[PDB]
Amino acid sequence: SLQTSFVTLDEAIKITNRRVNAIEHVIIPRIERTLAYIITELDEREREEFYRLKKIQEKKKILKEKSD
Amino acid sequence: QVWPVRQVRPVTEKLPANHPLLTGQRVLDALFPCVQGGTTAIPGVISQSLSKYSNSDVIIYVGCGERGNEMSEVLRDFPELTMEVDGKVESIMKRTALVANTSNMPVAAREASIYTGITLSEYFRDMGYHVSMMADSTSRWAEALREISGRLAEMPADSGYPAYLGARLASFYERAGRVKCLGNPEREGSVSIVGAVSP
């Protein structure tokens, strides 16, 4: 009764220690460098909005220098 | 009488809201209840239960930027939507006013359909009635503010919206509440607002 539960236990340990190491090494390092890509790409959408708004505030100043 | 839409109707005293607004849906009435005189926000034709019942006297529905063939179904079934009062099968267009505004209509008139439907709702508030306002898709109202502020060359907030977007929604949601109305016969009315956002 202790031989048949022994050899079926390390059959269910290798299918669990692989599923733990499939998450720590394949699934989580794919998500944590996906999330590193969202932040670097959302910083570039803010500077493109920063450049479009500073372009307009430079144009609105020139039109207010004519009407003086 | 003639009243400007962007100016709040005067009143004697604002009162705390203590009576529930029974929507009829079981999750909205038991777990997360609304009261008459209170403000609500869903990410939303549907909501027929607000019309047939919910113990409110008049119903004012504002379709702010609603679609083409979905606006024409609201004004199609509302004349033949009936209810019971004391055993009489009575139609719901005796106590319903619609503010129909499709997105084909101009963008300056989309921001004025909200202020119109709350002024008619504050008018029937003053008679002692219990108004229930359903402002459909206020995200299209906030889209009309993004377009108008872009045409006047204004500086935006995050995601392109104008920076006074939080002060425009607050000037419409804070017009709803149970009150003691102005005038001598001592009556009390209320306005409930259910506004929709991006689903």
Next chain:
Amino acid sequence: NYLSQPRLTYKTVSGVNGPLVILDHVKFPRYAEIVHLTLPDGTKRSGQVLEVSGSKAVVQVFEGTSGIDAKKTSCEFTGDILRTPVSEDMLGRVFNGSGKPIDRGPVVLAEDFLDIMGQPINPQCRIYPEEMIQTGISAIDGMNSIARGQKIPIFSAAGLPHNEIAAQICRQAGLVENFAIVFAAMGVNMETARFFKSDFEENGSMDNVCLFLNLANDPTIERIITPRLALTTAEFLAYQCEKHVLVILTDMSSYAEALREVSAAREEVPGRRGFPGYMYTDLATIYERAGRVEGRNGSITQIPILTMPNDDITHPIPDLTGYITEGQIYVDRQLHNRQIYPPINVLPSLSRLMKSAIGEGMTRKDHADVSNQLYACYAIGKDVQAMKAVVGEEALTSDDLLYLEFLQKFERNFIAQGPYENRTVYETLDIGWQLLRIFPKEMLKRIPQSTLSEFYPR
């Protein structure tokens, strides 16, 4: 009525940048006024006033500023806004983006002159679309069905067969009545043009097809008036000569790119991703010119194809066309890589007018319940296929092998049909029950027992 005063001609061009030509010393200029440019070489271009300020008028030329001078270029002002010569003889012709004939026929002899912006329909006198259009495609007719007078786009991408299923529902009009097709093509290739132009004559259906095709070598400013010329003849053949028009506005993402280039030439405040802030209004004026009115027995149905960039449904073009139109049809890339035609992810597809166009008198009785169950079975099966790759194949449930056996039968028998199968709607539901019969009862939760007992034991 008519204007008899002579047209003022100005040689006072004071600025050219991109698509825009800026005039000066103009005497009382209108807004949206059409201007006829006369080049020094002798060629003639058209224009349209975008902005007036005192005696200055900013026009947008339709054919481009390539060669436009500032000393010798004369611009005569047509004293009215852009009005189109329309007739019933345009059905069966080929025009370009500006309405000029391409098929080597004559120019149009007008029955009337109609404004391209359209007159606004009173929303109180607008009747509701309830007659169901049978398209022949099971992924449309069985799941996301289309009424008669419903605006409904086709969300696609670059490299997907959106032109193939645009011409398939164009020759399989169904209605269980000779739909007069008006076709607007903006930014299409010559391969896409010759695909559509040969399909309509191979079926012999170019007796009633009006092509408005604007290719990629054509200038981009003609794309701004291309859907408004296509719709102002579609609402002539629907509200005056009472036919049942079907309007196919393919590549609506090449319309919004033409709308950005003008909006970036005027240096206006841009909205999201460089598109103008008025792109929600400018799209809605050409989507809500649809539907059907109460005095006339004509109708107009819009199917605008648009290709979203980088498979993004949160891009500002397919995000704004979801708020105006009445449910989308999603063409998916991952179903196209598995060689399934048509590749239609029914999980983000939607038809907001399908609830009233099906039922007992419209379709047969079990339509509202087998479409309600095939969606919920596909969504859970798409969720148990994601955990099949992660944690194990047979793991944690044996009835999940029924959901994956549904996903193999749904994608290969229901939605995969080939480019010439015309499945009727009764043939669509009979395939739909064969995929629900591999599920047992008590798992078909969304079907009540008053309809589950008639069609499950078959």
Next chain:
Amino acid sequence: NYLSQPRLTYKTVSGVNGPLVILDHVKFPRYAEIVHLTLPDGTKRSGQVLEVSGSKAVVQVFEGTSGIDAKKTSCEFTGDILRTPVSEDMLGRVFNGSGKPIDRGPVVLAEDFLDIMGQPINPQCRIYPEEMIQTGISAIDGMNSIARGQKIPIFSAAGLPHNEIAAQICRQAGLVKKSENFAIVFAAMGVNMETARFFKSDFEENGSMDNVCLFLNLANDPTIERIITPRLALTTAEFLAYQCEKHVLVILTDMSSYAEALREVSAAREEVPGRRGFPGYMYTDLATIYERAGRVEGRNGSITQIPILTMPNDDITHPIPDLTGYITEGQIYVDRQLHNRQIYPPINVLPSLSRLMKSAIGEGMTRKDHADVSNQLYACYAIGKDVQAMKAVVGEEALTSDDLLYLEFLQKFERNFIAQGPYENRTVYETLDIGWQLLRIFPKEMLKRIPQSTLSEFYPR
């Protein structure tokens, strides 16, 4: 320092665009000058001057710009910047966001006229905070205890009861009994009509209004008055503390609705929006109302702040709770996990922290076992939450006799210690006595963070 020159009244309005009114031909205009608009139909409005340029002065009207003409309106320049009428009899009065009384009372008799911007406290004059402020909540007084001068926010979300535990720690705040000059300045920014009515009718209906100075600012109030609301509330709290020498607690609720008003006026001055729409100077602007705290060297007063804010989408990387955690000194989380579980107050003490609680508690301050019963209740809470994840994948049988004792501690910690009820005022001694009734269900030698020099006196009972 009185000024006696008569005020000028200009009818020279030369431009209106949004909430700004542009004047012309102004004789030497001040920068932050307070002006008084007079409409053509007689209604009065106020306003701050926003930007001057030569003889042109751009004011922005408080109450809005509608109806303002260019020919018949008249603007009157009061020759000084915005001042505050401060007194000690503003303890028990309800003011709006601009300083006018709301509770049907008279104006304040103004025993001093102070500036709302103030001055920064000298770093050489500030002294370290020592004793404790009793809030009456066991999750705050027991395990995340606050000092006298500590700045500690309450990180909440939309829908969580951060307004209900703000009103709780205002009704029952005291120093410590220790067997005395205590005041509270409550500033509400951007609240509803229902939340403002709840704050007015909870403080006056509980006897607490002998020492509360309440500043409402509704959401239908002008958005410029949300900026001068924490500047009014901290000017008077610098008059009560270290000018009248009483220990002051300042509760600045909804600090996420303050910086939505700061973003609004930053677009009125035509500035380019910085990170996530918020302005670039928001770290300086938030720290000019947080760093008006702490104790000073020569005066017995003190001032401690609890700036309550709602982080959107439960995000800590948002600029509102990230630029607050850089300057404030430890946080308190109201979380959705315990709130759906119906636990009031829903304060989880595992991510919460008070950085100066090692100074606040002690032998002469509360009693000498507070340092060990807080470390032991926190260590037994992390284990009892860890073994509760073992109860589902292993089983209730296979876990040992130790892990069955942590699970019986967990159902009693979150029901007797944290779960309090909105009207139960527990002292700092009644908090620690509940803290020993949950440690007595363990045998000792499991209580490894408590030394035996303090385990012998308080365990056997």
Next chain:
Amino acid sequence: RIEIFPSRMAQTIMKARLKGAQTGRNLLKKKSDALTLRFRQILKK
């Protein structure tokens, strides 16, 4: 290896998908430890 488009709601979707896998180890580390604890005492028996 990236998955989808950055849209400021994909940041809060992927922070929840990270939250699912961060607690997927700590729920399965102890399951592999409960199996190892019985494996090391059966071998003694």
